[PDB]
Amino acid sequence: MRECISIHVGQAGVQIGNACWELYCLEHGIQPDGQMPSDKTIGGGDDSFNTFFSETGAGKHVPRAVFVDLEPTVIDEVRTGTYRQLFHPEQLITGKEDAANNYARGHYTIGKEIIDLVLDRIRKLADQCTGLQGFLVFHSFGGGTGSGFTSLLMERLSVDYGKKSKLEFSIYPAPQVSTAVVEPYNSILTTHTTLEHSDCAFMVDNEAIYDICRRNLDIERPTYTNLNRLISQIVSSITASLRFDGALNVDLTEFQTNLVPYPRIHFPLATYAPVISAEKAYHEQLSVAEITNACFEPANQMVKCDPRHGKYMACCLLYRGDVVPKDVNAAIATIKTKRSIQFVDWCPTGFKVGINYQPPTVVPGGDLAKVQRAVCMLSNTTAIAEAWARLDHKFDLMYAKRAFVHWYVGEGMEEGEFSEAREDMAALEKDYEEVGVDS
Amino acid sequence: LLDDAVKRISEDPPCKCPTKFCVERLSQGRYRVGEKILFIRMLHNKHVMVRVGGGWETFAGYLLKHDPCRML
Amino acid sequence: MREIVHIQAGQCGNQIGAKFWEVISDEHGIDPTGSYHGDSDLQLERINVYYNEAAGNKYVPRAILVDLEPGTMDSVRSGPFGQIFRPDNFVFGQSGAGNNWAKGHYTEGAELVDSVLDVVRKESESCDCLQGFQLTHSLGGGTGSGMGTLLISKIREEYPDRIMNTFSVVPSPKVSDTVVEPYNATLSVHQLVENTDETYCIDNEALYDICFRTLKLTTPTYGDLNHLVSATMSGVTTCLRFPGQLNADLRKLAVNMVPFPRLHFFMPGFAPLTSRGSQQYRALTVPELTQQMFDAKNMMAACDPRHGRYLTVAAVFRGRMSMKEVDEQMLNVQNKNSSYFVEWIPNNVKTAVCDIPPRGLKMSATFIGNSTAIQELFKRISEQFTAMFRRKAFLHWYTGEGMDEMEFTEAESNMNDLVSEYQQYQ
Ligand SMILES: Nc1nc2c(ncn2[C@@H]2O[C@H](COP(=O)(O)OP(=O)(O)OP(=O)(O)O)[C@@H](O)[C@H]2O)c(=O)[nH]1
Ligand SMILES: Nc1nc2c(ncn2[C@@H]2O[C@H](COP(=O)(O)OP(=O)(O)OP(=O)(O)O)[C@@H](O)[C@H]2O)c(=O)[nH]1
Ligand SMILES: [Mg+2]
Ligand SMILES: [Mg+2]
Ligand SMILES: [Zn+2]
């Protein structure tokens, strides 16, 4: 019904954004040149696309994206790839050189030269909106641009707009899998900014999605196109109720205020259920009950922690497709009655439910079966605290002897900022463990 | 601006050499510390850094390896 | 955009740089005249990293070729791919440094450093934004190690924010035909610690061993040793020339691998090294590459990582590869070789994957490992230096051209400090 702006930051954000837009345009029937053939549309008009596209050009749709990177390369791949014709070029922002995995570059030394341009481009996109819902930020905590420039951009958004929601789809460093030596410095240094300047952070880690690709899709050699496709399905499901009519629809703002029990306790674990191998999809009936049951298994979580080490504060289930509301209540009752699934006792209900009539669409590539029912769970749990403790432990192991700190300090950072971001993380740990106590 | 802080940090601990160890300025950002034109940085809390070797060092920590009279 | 300028100092520098320009132009499909005859637009998309566009669809490499003696200019110019450099970057002396660091740093190199700085300037504003200099040189004599290092002093003195890379061929005890190598190496490493962002130590003994027991060549010429270091030079810089699924950059490798500013000496390795026959008896697979990169026989320095502890590692892969494979192989190596990686760094590997592989191979990898194994080579150089220096052997050659007995003592204390600082991390 309303519209929101997506900001894709750094290489992970930009690459995830490519798949997300390949999914949206294919879901709305929009071709890679931005045209959309005149369908039947009995009644007059199609407001499905307005949430993510502007109509300007008499049959031309332009997406409400900003792509930003301190590095040209991946933006030049988008300017060259199949979807190069969607974005009007002024919104594909680009720096001269990257942060190069250094937060202090992407925040202090180098980000400050590109912020004045992206702020102008989002102020220009927001004025085109009749009513703004929120901001969808795609980034990664381990990168320099992703971590530092997104942290800076979040404080700029919070100052300029204030009360507009800001969803944040962040890639988190995996427990063991890690492609950079310095990820823990960049991922503690985001944390203050994601606490203070964000409303919902859906952290997702790559070794969890590799396990989903191995266990569920039978993919032997998965690559980032498959992983980014799974994030794109999460993001499409979260905003499905804003684009299509449903039996029980949930607004983005009402969805947060349902799921966030306290202002700081705002870090939902994301999940998607009917994700199975294109052959094994013949052998499964794929009804509501078993896709609800998939959402609560540790193997289906998009972060490497298992919920049995904690308690759910809240869940929401965003069902879409051919889901009858009477089945959902039975599935929720079964989940509540089933043990080994722990909810904190001071939330009696513990669930928000959303039902949408649009079934998920499948892009060409054969990674996924065409299924008539899907659910995205996302859930707020004190089990997330273990991912951050195992990471803050890695940060301490290095910081105990200043192991790379000269690269950050020399890029205009006081060494007290490391200790501040570290004790802030620890305070968030204590906040998440104290709400682990049943009253 | 930083010229006052670069002066201050060089001689709050006084130079004890028989000829004073050089910390003159040519212009902004270019200091001939000990007959070598370093590149100098600061931003906040007056933390002052030199671009050296594989990365960066503090201006005081640099002198603590480069003027013989700072060693003892 | 994101340009690099290449500098060759001495015969070793000149000969490595020649083979380096050979392999680069082969990668980009550049006619020895300077024309383009490739079949992909990705090469044109970053041809400007190492080349300048000239009229008539002609490309000139962004290189300078320097030494105090004119014999290697004629060879490089008349040799293969010789008529591609504009005949103004060749700036040569007339006497030579005679394997003496004094001639390189004070008497002959000092009178030619202006003529090379004026060409490095002329190359520096011809680019959108260069990010670093690559110096190719030997630590054997003045030539590369004193002239080509006065050069990095002056370059750092005027371009401090940029990256300095030096592919320093370090001397080895079992290969030398110079008797003054301990003096020249010790004097060179004295300033190389201050003036460089990252230094790749190579020695010819390891490149000979790799030819003898990995490529199965019984008579390896310098044309063959130079192939390996040129393939390393291409591998370490291939990320900013071709699209990749994960990206490195020179500044990326600097912050991921230099933990403390002094600890920037690195040992390369290259993964798909195979004999022309035995290549069909082996898999083109990431597990095989990854295990080969960590083999103590495959390192391009005579020190083995076995006696030391890895501080940081970079592995830049080239080819149509899957990150899950690299990630599990990296964990495999770090877990079952855990005694060989430092404990106070949890993750020691930095990964990059590039979609365009070297010619002729499906997959390749360049390894760069910072380790406390590098300091034993420096201990051997310091032992050879102090054996000659206590007798003041050959000292008159350097003394009569500018140094005093103080400078040698300063160099030996500061190289002793470098080995003390590397062994501090066990
Ligand atoms: N899921 C996912 N992770 C990715 C992708 N590309 C990179 N990553 C991971 O994201 C993290 C940060 O990498 P980048 O996104 O390259 O970093 P950046 O934000 O561009 O920042 P700099 O390059 O350091 O300026 C690393 O852990 C990467 O492995 C991708 O397409 N999908
Ligand atoms: N890897 C490699 N090493 C070489 C090559 N040619 C020579 N060397 C090494 O480097 C030394 C040559 O000295 P250089 O400084 O390069 O050049 P030069 O012109 O001989 O210097 P001077 O004559 O002393 O002025 C030899 O003793 C070898 O140790 C080569 O092509 N490749
Ligand atoms: Mg980019
Ligand atoms: Mg010569
Ligand atoms: Zn002094």
Numbering used by the authors:
A (entry chain C): 1 to 439
B (entry chain A): 202 to 273
C (entry chain B): 1 to 44, 47 to 360, 369 to 436
Task: Quote the study that presented this structure, word for word.
The spectraplakin family protein GAS2 was originally identified as a growth arrest-specific protein, and recent studies have revealed its involvement in multiple cellular processes. Its dual interaction with actin filaments and microtubules highlights its essential role in cytoskeletal organization, such as cell division, apoptosis, and possibly tumorigenesis. The GAS2 family cross-links F-actin and MTs, which is essential for the regulation of axon morphology, cell apoptosis, and cell division. Notably, the GAS2 protein is the most diminutive spectraplakin, comprising a single type 3 CH domain and a GAR domain connected by a hinge linker (H-Linker, first panel). In summary, our research revealed that the GAS2 protein can promote MT nucleation, facilitate MT stabilization, bundle MTs or F-actin together, and crosslink F-actin bundles to MTs.
To further investigate the interaction between GAS2 and MT, we used the GAS2-GAR domain construct to elucidate the GAR structure bound to microtubules by single-particle cryo-EM analysis. Our analysis achieved a 3.2 Å resolution of 14-pf microtubules complexed with the GAS2-GAR domain. The density map reveals that the GAR domain is inserted into the tubulin intradimer groove. The atomic model of GAS2-GAR bound to tubulin reveals that the GAR domain interacts with microtubules primarily through the β3-β4-β5-α2 regions and associated loops. The β4-β5 loop forms a hairpin structure (G-hairpin) and penetrates into the groove of α-β tubulin intradimer. Specifically, GAS2 R242 potentially engages in a salt bridge with α-tubulin E411. Similarly, GAS2 β4 R252’s proximity to β-tubulin D199 implies a potential salt bridge consistent with the observed density. Furthermore, α-tubulin H11’-W407, Y408, V409, and G410 form a hydrophobic pocket, into which GAR domain β5 W257 snugly fits into this pocket alongside α-tubulin W407. While in our study, we observed that GAS2-GAR-decorated MTs displayed a dimer rise of 82.25 Å, indicating a 1.7 Å reduction.
